[PDB]
């Protein structure tokens, strides 16, 4: 908690003017040659704000044109599923996308009645469509994730249902930027009315198919039989109607603690920095649900795109690493159709509790670099049963070991917590407590140290033998890694291990620093000794550039 | 109350999508030759909704250009005060006005920090400016009054500070529609950024000078001295900050029962028809404040443009007619500096309680046709001390007999109630109860039925002697009128009166219908006999076409 009003309900003075911001999307423009206003279309698409000239009509027209061209180049002739979240700027962006796709003769499928669509609902729709074997579908999700009310975002999901990799995003980014530099000479656009009249835009209900299909991934019948008292704070996000339909279709005792949809997100409690941020894993942002935690056996929440999850019990808000370990431990014991050819994905900055759990089950661990992108292909072909990130986003397979969503899915992760509690009689936090009793309770932290550009660059291109330390916090170093053990890919940095702890260091993308992730199975004080030594080691390896 | 959720809190299903609506302002276009989409610029300016193609960018660009040209033609070279209310569509309209006015070399004055301004605050600003005697100022108010959240509006107030009359409005209307038919070719415009950098737009604080000036129209010291417990529901309207500053500046025990500014107006209770309508004189809409009526000596509310007032006492919400009679009876006995010649303005269809009051005061009554416009010139020149309409809107003079606002002013009418209560020790409902004990409690009703365009046309063009009856509801007819007795202007219909009651019939200005207003001082059964005989009379005179 950094801001004096962290954890308190937002005040009127904290709120955006929604109408003014939306107007700014049309009346303000990116400054030509100003890099800060340019399309930066990356792992999570392009994000910005109309009032900062970074999320305006020109950007989205440009991006939508770029996506139409690329998808056609790539032989993608089926429909494009275009979903949006409950951010203000998703409305104007949505319209720009329809105007341009329709003008390019792209068939678009949208949620009827201008509704909202979670990121995994777009992923799921693409996968289900493409399993029918005809022209390929892909998708666009119009969301800046949990970013404050004034922000907008837009991202692309190719036919494998997952987020677009750099081979797609870089091309799209450059084309969008050249289109901007050309004054939107090369953009095909028709009016909203013409687009709707064209026949290219089809409105369907994406909710029912997703909600009904949940029985093929989570044990919905077990949940029903347990008759748990469940709560959810939809956090004004894109899956609010999804939670309603889940409770209704499956006849669950599941209560929405509020049903607000408000583009100022005024019902929110302020995050640690005082921003309105819909972070389902932040205790400050989750203060509203946390105050009701005694009312439910189990409760949860999702960020605006519904790709992440927050799990509440009467003990509080679970730490995301803790829940990942529990999800994995449970899933691989309760999925008979996930045979020996189905492994566990883990990013290398995630808790080593995962390693202990997976070793204990006699399953294969695939350690990958930072980022969900490394799980997409394995989820898609069924070789990864589960892949998650320590920031509270994950996905796992259907019962039969085929994919449900190749993007992150917050709904299945919440429902899985319910299946766990229902099947085992123990909530996921009680599960973690037992793991911690068995393996020790690790202490985990993230920090950062000042670094010059030159240092940051050098950190990315090390090799294991540049690290001459033989010991870390009183234990022999068992590994010096510059590549991920699971897929061999570069980590763009360094990880040092002992039996009792580890650290990893990577250059900060945004600041003159490098980030340090570390963890100890012996506790806080030992973790603190790792931190100290981690800086010493990293200072040593890069003081010569 | 007709709708089954009348008076209930608004639900999420009742609300608009603010950003989608604002997008529609820029992406939806009026249809060429569709009269429902045309500019209709009248007594309240032009109102519509972006989603109905009746309040979109082309309309506002066209209207702003028409106003720029008309003010120049009319000799106005000073600044234009442009104020906006809290409707969503006020934001894009505001921007379009600045783009075009600055392109036309108009000097614009706005409330700083994108703040909101009551209609009477624009009127007052015009008056104060022009009283200095240099180049004339005029103004634009961006408001659809109490219309639902999806509506927008824009109206013009010339240098006398009141609403523009048809000599200006019809020219602006014809011109705007000409501009729309010519694809906006004669509209001059620059970007918002260019407008802000041009030096043509100045941002000031309009609140402080209005709030400080109140001491010159209402007896603030008397109110301060009484120490009453005052409540206000600003109803999410343009004067919310005005109530705050009045409380602070005058050190009043004045509580805002809600401080919400929300472009969905979600905090509202539903109106009698189940709509979200910010009608300060409607019991259903005021259900929230009415539930707290027992906490305050006096409480009040205003509509979004803050030109109307609703007065609450522990007895409930006052009938607007009833409050006018009290306001008049009080003011004309407590304004010693007003000349003996200063008159009372009264519309045609207001209560004859006003007549009884004004007679008793030995003051001049000026009965005018429907509409506040008939009071502007007399308020401006100080010959009308007070002008009010039955729909809960009025204005009156400063202590020294010079105008404060020549448009309707909800703030002074609310503060006057507190003055009345402070000075006399009785609230305004108590005073009305006394008026009723003295003269009788009148019974008032309005009727409506369908009529053809031809029957409607006839009704507006009668000659008094065409009424051949001698009696109305058992009393002799004392007057048969087709023109207002006060100013001689045509009423566009018929008024018949006796000593005990009256009726007036008038064609609807919007529907194929006529309305009949009637009132009896004998009670309900007498009023019902007036209703029956008025229908008979109207039927007979409309016996052709
Ligand atoms: Mg997210
Ligand atoms: Mg009004
Ligand atoms: Mg005039």
TrEMBL record, chains A, B:
Cofactor: Mg(2+)
Keywords on record: Isomerase, Magnesium, Metal-binding, Phosphoprotein
Alpha-D-phosphohexomutase alpha/beta/alpha domain segment(s): 39-178, 209-316, 319-438
Domain Alpha-D-phosphohexomutase C-terminal span(s) in chain numbering: 488-536
Residue list for modification Cysteine persulfide: 284
One GO cellular component term noted in the UniProt record for this chain: cytosol
Pfam families: PGM_PMM_I (PF02878), PGM_PMM_II (PF02879), PGM_PMM_III (PF02880), PGM_PMM_IV (PF00408)
Tree of life domain: Bacteria
Family matches, as InterPro entries: A-D-PHexomutase_a/b/a-I, A-D-PHexomutase_a/b/a-I/II/III, A-D-PHexomutase_a/b/a-II, A-D-PHexomutase_a/b/a-III, A-D-PHexomutase_C, A-D-PHexomutase_C_sf, A-D-PHexomutase_CS, PGM
SUPFAM superfamilies in the record: Phosphoglucomutase, C-terminal domain, Phosphoglucomutase, first 3 domains
NCBIfam families (alphabetical): pgm
Family the UniProt entry places it in: Belongs to the phosphohexose mutase family.
Protein name, entry field: Phosphoglucomutase
Protein source organism: Salmonella typhimurium (strain LT2 / SGSC1412 / ATCC 700720)
């Amino acid at each position: 908690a950094i801001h004096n009003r962290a954890g308190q309900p937002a005040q009127q003075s904290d709120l955006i003017n929604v109408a003014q911001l939306t107007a700014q999307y049309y009346v303000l423009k990116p400054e030509a040659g100003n890099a800060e206003h340019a399309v930066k279309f990356g792992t999570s698409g392009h994000r910005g704000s109309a009032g900062r000239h970074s999320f305006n009509e020109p950007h989205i027209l440009a991006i939508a044109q770029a996506i139409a061209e690329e998808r056609a180049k790539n032989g993608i002739t089926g429909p494009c599923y275009v979903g949006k979240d409950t951010h203000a700027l998703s409305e104007p962006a949505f319209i720009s996308v329809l105007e341009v796709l329709a003008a390019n003769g792209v068939d678009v499928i949208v949620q009827e009645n201008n509704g909202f669509t979670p990121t995994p609902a777009v992923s799921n729709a693409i996968l289900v469509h493409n399993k029918k074997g005809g022209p390929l579908a892909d998708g666009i999700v119009i969301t800046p994730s949990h970013n404050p009310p004034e922000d907008g975002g837009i991202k692309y999901n190719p036919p494998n249902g997952g987020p677009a990799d750099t081979n797609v995003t870089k091309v799209v980014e450059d084309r969008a930027n050249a289109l901007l530099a050309g004054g939107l000479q090369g953009v095909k656009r028709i009016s909203l009315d013409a687009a709707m009249a064209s026949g290219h835009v089809k409105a369907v209900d994406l909710v029912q198919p997703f909600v009904e299909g949940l029985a093929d991934i989570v044990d919905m019948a077990a949940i029903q039989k347990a008759g748990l008292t469940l709560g959810v704070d939809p956090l004004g996000g894109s899956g609010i109607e999804y939670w309603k339909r889940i409770a209704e279709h499956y006849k669950l005792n599941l209560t929405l603690v509020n049903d607000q949809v408000d583009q100022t997100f005024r019902f929110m409690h302020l995050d640690k920095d005082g921003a309105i941020r819909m972070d389902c894993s932040s205790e400050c942002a989750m203060a509203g649900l946390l105050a009701l935690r005694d009312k439910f056996d189990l409760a949860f929440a999702n960020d605006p795109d519904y790709d992440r999850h927050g799990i509440v019990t009467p003990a509080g808000l679970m730490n995301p690493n803790h829940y990942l370990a529990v999800a994995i431990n449970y899933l691989f014991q309760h999925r008979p159709l996930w045979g020996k050819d189905v492994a566990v994905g883990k990013t290398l900055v995630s808790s080593a509790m995962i390693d202990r759990v997976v070793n204990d089950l006699g399953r294969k661990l695939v350690e990958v670099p930072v980022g969900f992108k490394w799980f997409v292909d394995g989820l898609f072909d069924g070789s990864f049963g589960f892949g998650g990130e320590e920031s509270a986003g994950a996905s796992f397979l259907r019962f039969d070991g085929t994919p449900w969503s190749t993007d992150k899915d917050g709904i299945i992760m919440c429902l899985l917590a319910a299946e766990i509690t229902a099947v085992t009689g123990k909530n996921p936090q009680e599960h973690y407590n037992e793991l911690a009793a068995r393996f020790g309770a690790p202490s985990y932290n993230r920090l950062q140290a000042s670094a010059t550009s030159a240092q940051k660059a050098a950190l990315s291109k090390l090799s294991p033998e540049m690290v001459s330390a033989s010991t870390l916090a009183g234990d022999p170093i068992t590994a010096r890694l510059t590549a991920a053990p699971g897929n061999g890919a570069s980590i763009g940095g360094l990880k040092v291990m002992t039996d009792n702890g580890w650290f990893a260091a990577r250059p900060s993308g945004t600041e003159d620093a490098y980030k340090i992730y570390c963890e100890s199975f012996l506790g806080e004080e030992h973790r603190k000794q790792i931190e100290k030594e981690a800086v010493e080691i990293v200072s040593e390896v890069l003081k010569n550039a």
